[PDB]
Amino acid sequence: VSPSSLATGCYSSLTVDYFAYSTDMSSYLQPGSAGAIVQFNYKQDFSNPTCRVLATVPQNLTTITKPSNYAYLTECYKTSAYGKNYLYNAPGAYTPCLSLASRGFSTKYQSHSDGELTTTGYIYPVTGNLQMAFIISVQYGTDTNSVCPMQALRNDTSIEDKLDVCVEYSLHGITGRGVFHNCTSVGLRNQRF
């Protein structure tokens, strides 16, 4: 998908994941990257069309506040009789060490353990304007209604004066080309298509 097609078209659903994130760690968010970010913090899912955006938020716009540190996880594992067993993220999901990681981190390489589970965190201060990451994904064709951006909205038209000719159509966010003909009702009319 391209960002300029999200601006002129309609989709069934929109999903946005967002967090604070330094821009100079951007290559750790790439697909194919190998460090601790994809392993223990966030793994992007690619089954739908999707975009990844990094951005800075400026001073007097918005009411977004700043945290004190940036913070990611360096390890998540369970102990066993043999040794450590590293628990890796699934695509789109949360880490299994999330309840341990809610205890906070005060120093770099601080650990938290509960039973088998152990987690280690890494913090470093926020300097300058805050930076953020957004993982966006859209769906097509799974709904009778649409999500549309306001610049893509047109008023309304009728078909009753243009039957049996080829026209463009935009029907509740479903767009295309076709010829229309008055018919007898078939299918469930609550499903619209």
């Binding site: 069934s12 064709g141 799974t142 709904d143 009778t144 078939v186 299918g187 469930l188 499903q191 619209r192 298509f193």
Partner: peptide, 8 residues
């Protein structure tokens, strides 16, 4: 299925 119907 959601968003759609089929007929016969």
């Amino acid at each position: 299925p959601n968003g759609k119907s089929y007929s016969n």
